[PDB]
Paper text:
In a double-blinded, placebo-controlled phase 1 human clinical trial, the recombinant, germline-targeting envelope glycoprotein (Env) trimer BG505 SOSIP.v4.1-GT1.1, adjuvanted with AS01B, induced bnAb precursors of the VRC01-class at a high frequency in the majority of vaccine recipients. These bnAb precursors, that target the CD4 receptor binding site, had undergone somatic hypermutation characteristic of the VRC01-class. To verify that VRC01-class mAbs elicited by GT1.1 do not just exhibit similar sequence features to VRC01-class bnAbs but also target the CD4bs in a similar manner and with the same atomic contacts, we selected five mAbs for further structural characterization.
A subset of isolated VRC01-class monoclonal antibodies neutralized wild-type pseudoviruses and was structurally extremely similar to bnAb VRC01. Hence, some GT1.1-elicited VRC01-class BCRs acquired mutations that confer strong binding to native trimers with intact glycan shields.
Residue numbers in the entry:
A (entry chain H): 1 to 52, 52A, 53 to 82, 82A, 82B, 82C, 83 to 100, 100A, ...
B (entry chain L): 2 to 91, 96 to 211
Write the structure that this text describes.
């Protein structure tokens, strides 16, 4: 086994700094280079730099030169990555990838990633509004919930405490101009059950430790 | 050192032979790697040198190319091979190629949801349009308020391809102030897809 475990998600105000750890096991930590990656939402991968764990020497990309600090602790086989003076386009998922010897091309093993969100907004619980059905679509009706104005990602939406899974589509969140995320979760159900079957969406927002249960009733 | 990866997105059926090409701007010897990334997942190394398959990768993945060609061929496509592929040239990564499951064209089931009364009391109205189980993913969504195109005050997102029917679903939200939402009557959502347009509408208060 070759394993790379990173620290939990971080939320930072602009101008602050974030530090992410990369605890490795299953191999000699000093025999391989450790690289740092990041991926903006909907974008590709870009390379930030690497650190040689033997002596701590680093090689940063010119984009992050003078703004990223990469260290390591051999006693715990952990590599650290710090990014200072954060900005909106510093939001993304950061990875630590292993490469053989004094190389950078083969990235055989990667960490699970660390979500870093940079914004002037503060962590806020979501406002769940009903997508109430009426039906004018044959024997199938559509209903759902609108998870509105929450920060940061992510939120998880289930239906009837997971009892209702067929026909459920939970769409990716969109970043509004106010800096707050908003997504919708929908489910197609038989129209004959709108007035009798109870439909409840369970929205969980771990960053704010807020769970909202909302019943969607027909109009 | 620059990278151009093509095609941006292709659609192929299971068992087909696909080729993804990514080209460098200059001589790179054999310093090119290929990676596979599924949505919400971690990138996985497939081929590292220029044709040297990583241990554990199935034989259907093959690499080839010299100079600046550097193709990537999958001999027989598999259900688990539908993802986005990246190529790496030194410290630069390519834009990426999305591999899609080919399927029949399907018209979406269009639903429109008026803003909830609960949300209207806070001063903001959000009307949501739902596109259910359509193909291909390329679909144009437009909002018309009192027979007038809005064009600049809406957002949308697309779910990942369904594992059963290989279709897509889209949700679009038109954001208006409470005052503006109550100055108009007709709200319509139009889906344009392959010589077919479907418009779902409702009248406020009716």
């Amino acid at each position: 086994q070759v394993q790379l475990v990173q620290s939990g998600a971080e939320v930072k105000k602009p101008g602050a700094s974030v530090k992410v750890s990369c605890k490795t096991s299953g191999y000699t930590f000093t025999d391989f280079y450790m690289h740092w990656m990041r991926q903006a939402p909907g974008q590709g991968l870009e390379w930030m730099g690497w650190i040689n764990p033997t002596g701590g020497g680093v090689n940063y990309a010119h984009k992050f030169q003078g703004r990223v600090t990469m260290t390591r602790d051999t006693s715990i086989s952990t590599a650290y990555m710090e990014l200072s003076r954060l900005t909106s386009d510093d939001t993304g998922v950061y990875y630590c990838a292993r490469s053989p010897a004094r190389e950078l091309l083969p990235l055989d093993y990667w960490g699970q990633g660390t979500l870093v969100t940079v914004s002037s907004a503060s962590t806020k619980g979501p406002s769940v509004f009903p997508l109430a059905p009426s039906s004018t679509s044959g024997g199938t009706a559509a209903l759902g919930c609108l998870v509105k104005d929450y920060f940061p990602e992510p939120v998880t939406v289930s239906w009837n405490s997971g009892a209702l899974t067929s026909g459920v589509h939970t769409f990716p969140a969109v970043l509004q101009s106010s800096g707050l995320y908003s997504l919708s979760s929908v489910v197609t159900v038989p129209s004959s059950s709108l007035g009798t079957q109870t439909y409840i969406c369970n929205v969980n927002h771990k960053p704010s430790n807020t769970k909202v249960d909302k019943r969607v009733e027909p109009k | 050192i620059q990278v151009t990866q093509s095609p941006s997105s292709l659609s192929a059926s299971v068992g087909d032979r696909v080729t993804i090409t990514c080209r460098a701007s200059q001589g790179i010897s054999n310093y090119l790697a290929w990676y596979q990334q599924k949505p919400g997942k971690v990138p996985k190394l497939l081929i590292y040198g220029a044709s040297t398959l990583q241990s554990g990768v199935p034989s259907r993945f093959s690499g080839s190319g010299s100079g600046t060609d550097f193709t990537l061929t999958i001999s027989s496509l598999q259900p688990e091979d539908f993802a986005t592929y990246y190529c790496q040239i030194y410290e630069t990564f390519g834009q990426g190629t999305k591999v899609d499951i080919k399927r029949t064209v399907a018209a979406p089931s269009v639903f429109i949801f008026p803003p909830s009364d609960e949300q209207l009391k806070s001063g903001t109205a959000s009307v949501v349009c739902l596109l259910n189980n359509f193909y291909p993913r390329e679909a144009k969504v437009q909002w018309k308020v009192d027979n007038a195109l809005q064009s600049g005050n809406s957002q949308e997102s697309v779910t990942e391809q369904d594992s059963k029917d290989s279709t897509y679903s889209l949700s679009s939200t038109l954001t208006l102030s409470k005052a503006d939402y109550e100055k108009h009557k007709v709200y319509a959502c139009e889906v344009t897809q392959g010589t077919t347009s479907v418009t779902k509408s409702f009248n406020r208060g009716e």
